[model samples]
Target chain A: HMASEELQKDLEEVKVLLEKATRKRVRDALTAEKSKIETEIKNKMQQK
Target chain B: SHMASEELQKDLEEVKVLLEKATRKRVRDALTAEKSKIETEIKNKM
Candidate 1:
């Protein structure tokens, strides 16, 4: 549960980063990372 | 279907958040299209 919370926090961080990111490369990187975190969260929840 | 719908919902919310905060036309248009795609997927799922 705590791990999932951490992932959620990570997701929020990435979102903020994405919002402020001006460079296309940086935005893309953050977007990809956020998608990875979303996938991880999905897997963790499905493991239940 | 229910579980997947919830996932799409969250995805939609994220898209909206990003689109709202977007500054550039490039980013805004990309996210707008992504939001459209997700909305369509959600509708078809329902």
Candidate 2:
């Protein structure tokens, strides 16, 4: 439960970081974002 | 087909929260992830 809220807060932080990138950048970062989220999942698995 | 339930639960929550705040192509990616998530949930319901 706490992990969920913390991960949520983390998402909002990155959304802005990646959202501000150029459109092309965002397009390209799609995979980057995916990979990052994969890492995120792994981390969350360990968060608690 | 998964991590422990708590991990998957956090995974889904993060994805849901992320989708709500995402914009631009990130928004598109987020939705696709959400769709895939829904698909998986249904698959698990079987």
Candidate 3:
């Protein structure tokens, strides 16, 4: 349960990273990172 | 719960993508959307 919550925080961090990357015009990397975070979130939810 | 999870995830994911690929205004919109999604998810889970 705590781990899931921590993963959620990681998801938020990735979200922030995506925002920063977009601001800096690093579109490709942002996209990939966003996808990875989403997948991890999904996996964690499924694990729950 | 499944539907909620999927829908929330999709909304958040889109906001994530948009935040990563758009201009300042678009990114702002995405941030608003993301905030709303997070709020809604928290409420739903509660």
**Candidate number that wins on TM-score, 2 or 3:** 2
Going through the candidates in order, state the TM-score of chain A alone for each one: 0.87, 0.41, 0.54
Per-candidate clashes, comma-separated: 0, 0, 0
lDDT of each: 0.67, 0.54, 0.55
DockQ (model 3, Cα): 0.03
Where model 1 places Cα greater than 4 Å from the true spot, the runs are A1-48, B1-3
lDDT of 2: 0.54
Displacement of the residue A19 alpha carbon in candidate 2, Å:
10
lDDT of 1 by residue, B1-46 (tens): 4438877777677777666665544345556776787789888965
Q: Of the pair 1 and 3, which is ahead by lDDT?
A: 1
- Residue A19 lDDT, candidate 2, scale 0-100: 50
Candidate number of the best TM-score: 1
Report per-candidate DockQ. 0.03, 0.03, 0.03
What TM-score, computed on C-alpha atoms, does each candidate reach? 0.48, 0.39, 0.37
Q: Candidate 1: give the clashing pairs.
A: none
lDDT score, candidate 3:
0.55
Clashing pairs in 2: none
Give candidate 1's error at residue A41 in angstroms. Answer: 34
| Candidate 3 chain A: 10-residue stretch with minimal lDDT | A21-30
